[PDB]
Amino acid sequence: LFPPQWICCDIRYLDVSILGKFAVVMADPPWDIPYGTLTDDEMRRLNIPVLQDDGFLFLWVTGRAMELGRECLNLWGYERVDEIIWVKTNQLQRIIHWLNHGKEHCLVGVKGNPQGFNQGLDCDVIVAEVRSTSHKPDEIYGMIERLSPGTRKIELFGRPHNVQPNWITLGNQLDGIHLLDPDVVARFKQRYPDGIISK
Amino acid sequence: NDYCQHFVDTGHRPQNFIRDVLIRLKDELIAKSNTPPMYLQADIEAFDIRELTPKFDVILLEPPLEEYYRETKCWTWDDIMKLEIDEIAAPRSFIFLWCGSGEGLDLGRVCLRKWGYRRCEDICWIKTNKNNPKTLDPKAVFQRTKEHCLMGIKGTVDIDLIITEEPEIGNIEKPVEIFHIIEHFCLGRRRLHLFGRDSTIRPGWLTVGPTLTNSNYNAETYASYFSAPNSYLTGCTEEIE
Numbered sequence A: 001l002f003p004p005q006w007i008c009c010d011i012r013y014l015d016v017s018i019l020g021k022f023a024v025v026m027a028d029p030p031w032d033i034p035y036g037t038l039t040d041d042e043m044r045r046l047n048i049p050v051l052q053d054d055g056f057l058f059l060w061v062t063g064r065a066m067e068l069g070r071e072c073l074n075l076w077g078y079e080r081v082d083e084i085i086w087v088k089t090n091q092l093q094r095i096i097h098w099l100n101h102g103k104e105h106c107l108v109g110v111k112g113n114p115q116g117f118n119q120g121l122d123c124d125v126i127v128a129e130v131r132s133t134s135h136k137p138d139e140i141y142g143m144i145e146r147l148s149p150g151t152r153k154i155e156l157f158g159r160p161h162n163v164q165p166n167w168i169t170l171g172n173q174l175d176g177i178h179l180l181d182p183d184v185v186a187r188f189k190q191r192y193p194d195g196i197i198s199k
Numbered sequence B: 001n002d003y004c005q006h007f008v009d010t011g012h013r014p015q016n017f018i019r020d021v022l023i024r025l026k027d028e029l030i031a032k033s034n035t036p037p038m039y040l041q042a043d044i045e046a047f048d049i050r051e052l053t054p055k056f057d058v059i060l061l062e063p064p065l066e067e068y069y070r071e072t073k074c075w076t077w078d079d080i081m082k083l084e085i086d087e088i089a090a091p092r093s094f095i096f097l098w099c100g101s102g103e104g105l106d107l108g109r110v111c112l113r114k115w116g117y118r119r120c121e122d123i124c125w126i127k128t129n130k131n132n133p134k135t136l137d138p139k140a141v142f143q144r145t146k147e148h149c150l151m152g153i154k155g156t157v158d159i160d161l162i163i164t165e166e167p168e169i170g171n172i173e174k175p176v177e178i179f180h181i182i183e184h185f186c187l188g189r190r191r192l193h194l195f196g197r198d199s200t201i202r203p204g205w206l207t208v209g210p211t212l213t214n215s216n217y218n219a220e221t222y223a224s225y226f227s228a229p230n231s232y233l234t235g236c237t238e239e240i241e
């Protein structure tokens, strides 16, 4: 089901096995380092490994999560094979602890033996304007679509604007449950006959 | 405007379109404070590092990675990890380590931890290709257009980006700007550059490398530049009368 889909839930507790396998996973976690944060052990316990067999993980990091995110990436069974940086500009294409930070990092991990992807189409730098705070640039999606066109993709810790075709978006600030893929709608009803996700 | 789509369309890397890419008393103060350049030819694999004294406030480490020779002795991370960097680093000191863009971004972090540092900055050298609108690493997912220099600290004005045009094939030089970023930190005066070259010799720095053609290093002479009353200067203050 190509059009946007999403699930308001706590990713800590949702049974993500109902979602099937994805070619690309993206996460922009609320690293514990102003909103609902997760602890490092909670981050480590996320059931990422079920989400994929062969494919790519995109994982945004900052600060000390630069190391912690590498740890999680490895724990979950990926190899870091690239790292994208987003150069933050204003509308006039000028750049926005010890140094001022002109960039944000997104680790790229691979799992299994993915085949049929278009590696090498884009380059590891994004140059794009800041929108709201904590908002990743839309260009990541075009990059991810060219890398792996038409495939199933899941985003973790998304927010309303993040919903995209071919993507299922999980986040706690989303508006209810909107699912259109039959295989998912089936497994959802079976695991959650009453539309509530608790333990 | 979507500069990733545009790179896909025309071959211009997104960074080509960043525009614009006084602290003058500093720099002059730095320049007054700089020791005479000192340099020493040494095969660092075969060279007892401890023979370099006194302990350094800043270490810039630029080992020749195999990936630097796309179309051209390479040091592996295996080799680099075995360097005894903690033996010549001062209790409070700083390391700047050039890690490339591949496995170095991980193995370099292992080195920093192995030698006793915590990373506090990741400096990115973003290479524009305005003058020539890439054969990829096997594991690569994207075209690689940058290099990382990791900053580590141990113990108690500038941006984390350097933008320049990609050097000619087989030019392994790193942007001189890295030196400016380091000097503007005002971290102390004993500064070591491991795997430097004749071309990187510079006031304020001790350069050690296998390809240096001449040497002038002398431990006692070097040490004399930091004896009292000069032991603790940042490099950003006036000389003591």
Ligand SMILES: CC1(C)CCN(Cc2ccc(N3CC(=O)NC4(CCN(c5ncnc6[nH]ccc56)CC4)C3)cc2)CC1
Binding pocket: A009, A010, A011, A012, A028, A029, A030, A031, A035, A036, A037, A038, A060, A061, A062, A104, A134, A135, A136, A137, A157, A158, A159, A170, A171, A172, A173
């Ligand atoms: C490109 C960047 C600069 C890179 C770094 N990063 C840092 C960042 C900043 C803010 C946020 N969050 C802000 C927010 O308000 N909500 C969420 C989204 C839904 N969400 C949850 N969804 C399901 N289960 C949950 N359990 C507990 C929370 C929770 C809480 C977080 C996003 C996430 C990451 C930003 C972009």
